[PDB]
Amino acid sequence: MAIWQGRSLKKPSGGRIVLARKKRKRELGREPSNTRVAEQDKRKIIRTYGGNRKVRLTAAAYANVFDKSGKGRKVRIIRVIENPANRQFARRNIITKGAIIETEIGKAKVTSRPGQDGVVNAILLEE
Amino acid sequence: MRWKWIKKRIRRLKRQRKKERG
Amino acid sequence: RKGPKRHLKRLAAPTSWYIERKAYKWAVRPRPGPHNMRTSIPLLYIVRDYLGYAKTAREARKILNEGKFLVDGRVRKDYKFPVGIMDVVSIPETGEHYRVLPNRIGKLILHPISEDEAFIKPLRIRNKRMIKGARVQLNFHDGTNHIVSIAEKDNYFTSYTVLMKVPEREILEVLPFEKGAYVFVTQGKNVARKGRIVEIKRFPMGWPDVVTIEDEEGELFDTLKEYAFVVGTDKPKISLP
Amino acid sequence: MARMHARKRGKSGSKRPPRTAPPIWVEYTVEEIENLVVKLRKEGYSTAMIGTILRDQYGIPSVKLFKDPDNPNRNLTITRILEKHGLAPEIPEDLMFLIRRAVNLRKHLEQHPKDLHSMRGLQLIESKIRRLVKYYKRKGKLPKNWRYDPETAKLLVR
Amino acid sequence: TLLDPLANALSHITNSERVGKREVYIKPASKLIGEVLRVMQKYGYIGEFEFIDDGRAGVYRVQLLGRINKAGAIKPRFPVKVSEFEKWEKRFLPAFEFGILIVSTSQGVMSHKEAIEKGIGGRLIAYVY
Amino acid sequence: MMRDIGLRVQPPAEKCDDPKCPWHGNLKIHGRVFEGIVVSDKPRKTVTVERQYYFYLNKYERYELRRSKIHAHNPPCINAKVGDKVLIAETRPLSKTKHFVVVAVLERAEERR
Amino acid sequence: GKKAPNGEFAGRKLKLKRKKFRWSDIRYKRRVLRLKEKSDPLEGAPQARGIVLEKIAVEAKQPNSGMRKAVRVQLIKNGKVVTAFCPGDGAIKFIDEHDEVIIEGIGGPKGGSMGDIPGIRYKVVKVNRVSLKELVKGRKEKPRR
RNA sequence: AGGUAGUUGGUGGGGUAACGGCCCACCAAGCCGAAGAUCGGUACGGGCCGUGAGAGCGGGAGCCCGGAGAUGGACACUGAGACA
RNA sequence: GCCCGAGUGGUGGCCACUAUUAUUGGGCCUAAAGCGGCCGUAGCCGGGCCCGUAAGUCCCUGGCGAAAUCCCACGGCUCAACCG
RNA sequence: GAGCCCGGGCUCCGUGAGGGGGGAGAAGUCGUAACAAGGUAACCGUAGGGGAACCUACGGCUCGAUCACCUCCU
């Protein structure tokens, strides 16, 4: 779990700003996640404070693809190759809003947040 | 007068500054 | 205080209702409803203070459960009801009608007119927006929402004059606001004036979007398109007659 | 009138002719005047002294009054006559004479260094240059990239 | 150098006055002073003036009736609203009668009394009474 | 890319702006507008504009000079330069200190102080 | 120019000047720091009770000689030694050692003991929560313990 | 009197109701300061209040308005809403 | 005998007096107080004459600075305080 | 992810032998320093020396001395 804000760091003028309150519930946050490549799909539903249930993917097994006409599929994926953020992430197969992955035919670029929305689909990279 | 005082002040200073230096 | 403010004090009670200021340590606080809180007037007040029908609120509340008042051509019973502005309020047990009109001063007053004008209620709608099923809808800032206008605008942006058949919940006789039409001013420190619009020429960048008007007197008033309310081509009576 | 600068002494009261249009008992054409100027700048004389010799010999007290109007944008006078020809030094004479002198001082001090007073006018002449520089930059006879120093004074003179 | 050339005009004009010379000479000259003497003459405080524009400078030779008591410029030259006038009225002037707190204005230049009759204001320039 | 911005001003001659400009994405122009002068270009796509205003002092009847730095994001369609007025939009945050984006530049070779 | 800059934008100089020159009023400086409040015990207060350690009599000043009645009292929370001047003629009598004695100032907090008395900053009002001017008059109340 | 290392910005990403170095991976070396920053003291802030011819100076009491707290200090559930 | 009168007095604090903090509205030869003298950076302050802008500046309109307290009227409570 | 603890560094509060000075008390003692040219004019910055006030040197200043002697100035 992560506290913040975010008024408790330093001033943009190298002053120390001190927190003059405590936590506010609305202003707490959760930790990052590792969405794995697997054959199974491990989901969980979690209830936000705006009072809306949002899905967290803790695993997935299907993405699947889009052209420039847009014909979607649900089929097998294989290893995550190239993650922008850190190559460490590209070893342990963490799906991201900008991840790159190998699909069945062609490489495809992830284009959705699976940590608030619960979706994985992609659009083909053309060489 | 200010002769006095200047050397009194100086002697005070020195003697005391001697006591600080020591 | 880190929850919701669910009391209001007399000293904290706004003087655009003409309440008595030091009567007690607590004022009657509007619940949410039709229209804005520091632009509304409580049913309690119209009963207890405005029209004297009550001594204690045990009176008023009984009075509002049985039915001495309908709001918007419709029955009520919450004795914390914000009665809207430019509003139709009816006594059915005597046959009275009042408009909730602002005075020149800026306190909320009830202006009594006949039963005939109590079927019509001019709406200028607060926004206009598309919805799903390929429809638009007519808004208001007393909340009242209508569906249907036979696809697309066919009329005006939002500065409308609508004829609402208020017992019937129906919209009738739509009419734009034009450069020789009448407007009643409901917000601003120019309130209680009804006039003939000179023009609708504007300097829209940022929040202000300007509209001028000159009245029977000739007092140049600059109100927002929104502070401007289209009274029409003249139907209901002016406040302060 | 005066300014006692690095002095207490009231300044000379030398004063201009209050003539606003020129003598006609004196007579020269726009062409003749222009020749006289060009001949004198060819000698090695400089614009103040050019205006001096013309005054003492040819009887013209200031050029502006005689010349303009012949292109009434502004007054036509010595160096504005020179620039149209390309005979003008890109450094204003003001700033030049100044720096010129300055480099001579330094050499004295070089050999003689026990000199209060001579040291103290080095300090008094530089600081007039500095000013004269500062404003010109903004007016534009001298680029903004420049800055003044005693090696960048020994390079301009040579 | 000089600054406030006006003021160095005015101040002469008054110290001129206090002696009781006949006429004045003000070596530096201008619009400000010119205009101000104009307005001054218009109220009447002074007699006639001629300026001669020498290729050097304007000079004003001014005729002194005897009227003027005191007439001075304002130091930072404050902006003054038309509501704040009354304050600046009570302070600087000697009483309600006189009314040449000379201001500078949108309309032009005026006294205090000529300003009030129009109804317009601004930064102060000088005074006269 | 290149669309009318309003305010009665014309949009830059070129366009190719990143998604932190109000010609792309979800950061959009809104609100009030200022004007100020470029101190520095040193950070990347980032430019300091410091404004001058006057303030009054009631006690002394006089004014004072105050100077408020404001941090401005420059769009790669146009380059800011030292010593020229720049026009600023009121937008949602880029960062801790960057709440502003540069909209229309009036450039100048001149410099005072 | 009689000092000050006068000019539209200068004011700040003005604004700092005053403040710079304000601190030559000892009184102002002292309060704005709070030296009045820190030094001359009390912690600032109107008055302070304290236990009468003993009774002492001291001498009068320069043109003068006469035995003023002074107590030594210890303020209780303050925990500070205060020597003190007692109003009235007989008085020193009605004050038993180790009765409570409330204490005040007397004649400007500046430090100024009245003209006669050298030290005494302070006054006594009370003996066992009944005062001294009440004990100079016989009838009003008379003392205990 | 110099301070600043998530420190200022950039790219991409996470988390959150949501923007944001809020958090984080990579990249850059900025950012702030004598128009007084930083650090130290002191202090809830505002409407007002006291006084004073005015200008000004001092002050945050009932009451109203907004924020903070609940033995000191941290921590989540349950609920639209609390870290109560 | 004088004052004041259910008050009157003591200590403490603040403001006035104190143009003893000088904007309004202070000084600085000898009373306190000119730097031993100069230079120029930052700053403030700037000769005349014409044209542009209208940023300051003034004028008008318009959005707006809650209620309360204050000031004035009328009305209410026997009166006023207090309230409408 | 708190409180809690541990080792070190830095700072602050209650309080302590001893130690410094002030405004004084003005009946003891030493001297006469200044104020009169104070009985060697006085002050002044600097340096040394003396128990003390202070003396002396060097430079300055008159807020400097009393005639006399000489020199200038309305």
PDB file of N, CA and C in Angstrom, chain A residues 49-77:
ATOM      1  N   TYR A  49     -13.597   3.143  -4.162  1.00  0.00           N
ATOM      2  CA  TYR A  49     -14.218   3.996  -3.139  1.00  0.00           C
ATOM      3  C   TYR A  49     -15.256   4.940  -3.791  1.00  0.00           C
ATOM      4  N   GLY A  50     -15.063   5.242  -5.083  1.00  0.00           N
ATOM      5  CA  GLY A  50     -16.137   5.775  -5.907  1.00  0.00           C
ATOM      6  C   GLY A  50     -17.317   4.817  -6.036  1.00  0.00           C
ATOM      7  N   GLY A  51     -17.160   3.591  -5.535  1.00  0.00           N
ATOM      8  CA  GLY A  51     -18.266   2.657  -5.347  1.00  0.00           C
ATOM      9  C   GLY A  51     -18.526   1.918  -6.636  1.00  0.00           C
ATOM     10  N   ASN A  52     -17.448   1.455  -7.254  1.00  0.00           N
ATOM     11  CA  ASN A  52     -17.520   0.816  -8.536  1.00  0.00           C
ATOM     12  C   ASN A  52     -16.478  -0.271  -8.506  1.00  0.00           C
ATOM     13  N   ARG A  53     -16.874  -1.444  -8.962  1.00  0.00           N
ATOM     14  CA  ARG A  53     -16.017  -2.609  -8.917  1.00  0.00           C
ATOM     15  C   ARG A  53     -15.230  -2.637 -10.194  1.00  0.00           C
ATOM     16  N   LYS A  54     -13.934  -2.797 -10.044  1.00  0.00           N
ATOM     17  CA  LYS A  54     -13.032  -2.757 -11.143  1.00  0.00           C
ATOM     18  C   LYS A  54     -12.219  -4.007 -11.031  1.00  0.00           C
ATOM     19  N   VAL A  55     -11.870  -4.549 -12.182  1.00  0.00           N
ATOM     20  CA  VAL A  55     -11.183  -5.815 -12.241  1.00  0.00           C
ATOM     21  C   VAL A  55      -9.694  -5.571 -12.238  1.00  0.00           C
ATOM     22  N   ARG A  56      -8.988  -6.361 -11.437  1.00  0.00           N
ATOM     23  CA  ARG A  56      -7.537  -6.470 -11.515  1.00  0.00           C
ATOM     24  C   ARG A  56      -7.205  -7.828 -12.135  1.00  0.00           C
ATOM     25  N   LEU A  57      -6.409  -7.822 -13.206  1.00  0.00           N
ATOM     26  CA  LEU A  57      -5.809  -9.045 -13.713  1.00  0.00           C
ATOM     27  C   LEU A  57      -4.550  -9.338 -12.976  1.00  0.00           C
ATOM     28  N   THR A  58      -4.497 -10.552 -12.428  1.00  0.00           N
ATOM     29  CA  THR A  58      -3.277 -11.080 -11.809  1.00  0.00           C
ATOM     30  C   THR A  58      -2.688 -12.166 -12.710  1.00  0.00           C
ATOM     31  N   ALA A  59      -3.478 -12.644 -13.665  1.00  0.00           N
ATOM     32  CA  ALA A  59      -2.921 -13.301 -14.827  1.00  0.00           C
ATOM     33  C   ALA A  59      -3.880 -13.156 -16.000  1.00  0.00           C
ATOM     34  N   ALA A  60      -3.404 -13.591 -17.162  1.00  0.00           N
ATOM     35  CA  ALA A  60      -4.167 -13.612 -18.416  1.00  0.00           C
ATOM     36  C   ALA A  60      -3.638 -14.732 -19.335  1.00  0.00           C
ATOM     37  N   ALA A  61      -4.394 -15.069 -20.387  1.00  0.00           N
ATOM     38  CA  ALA A  61      -3.953 -16.083 -21.374  1.00  0.00           C
ATOM     39  C   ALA A  61      -4.298 -15.812 -22.852  1.00  0.00           C
ATOM     40  N   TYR A  62      -4.911 -14.668 -23.124  1.00  0.00           N
ATOM     41  CA  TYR A  62      -5.460 -14.350 -24.427  1.00  0.00           C
ATOM     42  C   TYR A  62      -5.466 -12.859 -24.529  1.00  0.00           C
ATOM     43  N   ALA A  63      -5.092 -12.343 -25.690  1.00  0.00           N
ATOM     44  CA  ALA A  63      -5.097 -10.900 -25.907  1.00  0.00           C
ATOM     45  C   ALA A  63      -6.021 -10.673 -27.105  1.00  0.00           C
ATOM     46  N   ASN A  64      -5.425 -10.243 -28.198  1.00  0.00           N
ATOM     47  CA  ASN A  64      -5.669 -10.772 -29.514  1.00  0.00           C
ATOM     48  C   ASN A  64      -6.470  -9.870 -30.400  1.00  0.00           C
ATOM     49  N   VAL A  65      -6.081  -9.968 -31.653  1.00  0.00           N
ATOM     50  CA  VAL A  65      -5.357  -8.881 -32.305  1.00  0.00           C
ATOM     51  C   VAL A  65      -6.257  -7.873 -33.004  1.00  0.00           C
ATOM     52  N   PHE A  66      -5.630  -6.885 -33.645  1.00  0.00           N
ATOM     53  CA  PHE A  66      -6.296  -5.861 -34.439  1.00  0.00           C
ATOM     54  C   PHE A  66      -5.387  -5.453 -35.613  1.00  0.00           C
ATOM     55  N   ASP A  67      -6.008  -5.077 -36.733  1.00  0.00           N
ATOM     56  CA  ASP A  67      -5.320  -4.683 -37.981  1.00  0.00           C
ATOM     57  C   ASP A  67      -5.375  -3.162 -38.128  1.00  0.00           C
ATOM     58  N   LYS A  68      -5.799  -2.668 -39.297  1.00  0.00           N
ATOM     59  CA  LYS A  68      -6.378  -1.324 -39.442  1.00  0.00           C
ATOM     60  C   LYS A  68      -7.834  -1.348 -39.995  1.00  0.00           C
ATOM     61  N   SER A  69      -8.429  -2.553 -40.043  1.00  0.00           N
ATOM     62  CA  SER A  69      -9.884  -2.758 -40.136  1.00  0.00           C
ATOM     63  C   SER A  69     -10.497  -3.047 -38.753  1.00  0.00           C
ATOM     64  N   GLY A  70      -9.830  -3.915 -37.971  1.00  0.00           N
ATOM     65  CA  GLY A  70     -10.100  -4.083 -36.521  1.00  0.00           C
ATOM     66  C   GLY A  70     -10.726  -5.404 -36.093  1.00  0.00           C
ATOM     67  N   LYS A  71     -10.301  -6.509 -36.715  1.00  0.00           N
ATOM     68  CA  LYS A  71     -10.957  -7.801 -36.510  1.00  0.00           C
ATOM     69  C   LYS A  71     -10.370  -8.616 -35.363  1.00  0.00           C
ATOM     70  N   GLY A  72     -11.037  -8.513 -34.212  1.00  0.00           N
ATOM     71  CA  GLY A  72     -10.533  -9.009 -32.944  1.00  0.00           C
ATOM     72  C   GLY A  72     -10.543 -10.510 -32.843  1.00  0.00           C
ATOM     73  N   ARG A  73      -9.695 -11.020 -31.961  1.00  0.00           N
ATOM     74  CA  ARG A  73      -9.578 -12.438 -31.758  1.00  0.00           C
ATOM     75  C   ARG A  73      -9.307 -12.669 -30.288  1.00  0.00           C
ATOM     76  N   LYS A  74      -9.531 -13.909 -29.890  1.00  0.00           N
ATOM     77  CA  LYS A  74      -9.146 -14.429 -28.594  1.00  0.00           C
ATOM     78  C   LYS A  74      -8.423 -15.739 -28.867  1.00  0.00           C
ATOM     79  N   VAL A  75      -7.097 -15.693 -28.874  1.00  0.00           N
ATOM     80  CA  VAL A  75      -6.275 -16.880 -29.156  1.00  0.00           C
ATOM     81  C   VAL A  75      -5.016 -16.808 -28.295  1.00  0.00           C
ATOM     82  N   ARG A  76      -4.195 -17.843 -28.380  1.00  0.00           N
ATOM     83  CA  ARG A  76      -2.982 -17.939 -27.583  1.00  0.00           C
ATOM     84  C   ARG A  76      -1.942 -16.852 -27.887  1.00  0.00           C
ATOM     85  N   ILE A  77      -1.247 -16.467 -26.822  1.00  0.00           N
ATOM     86  CA  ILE A  77      -0.069 -15.608 -26.857  1.00  0.00           C
ATOM     87  C   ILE A  77       1.145 -16.409 -26.373  1.00  0.00           C
TER      88      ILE A  77
END
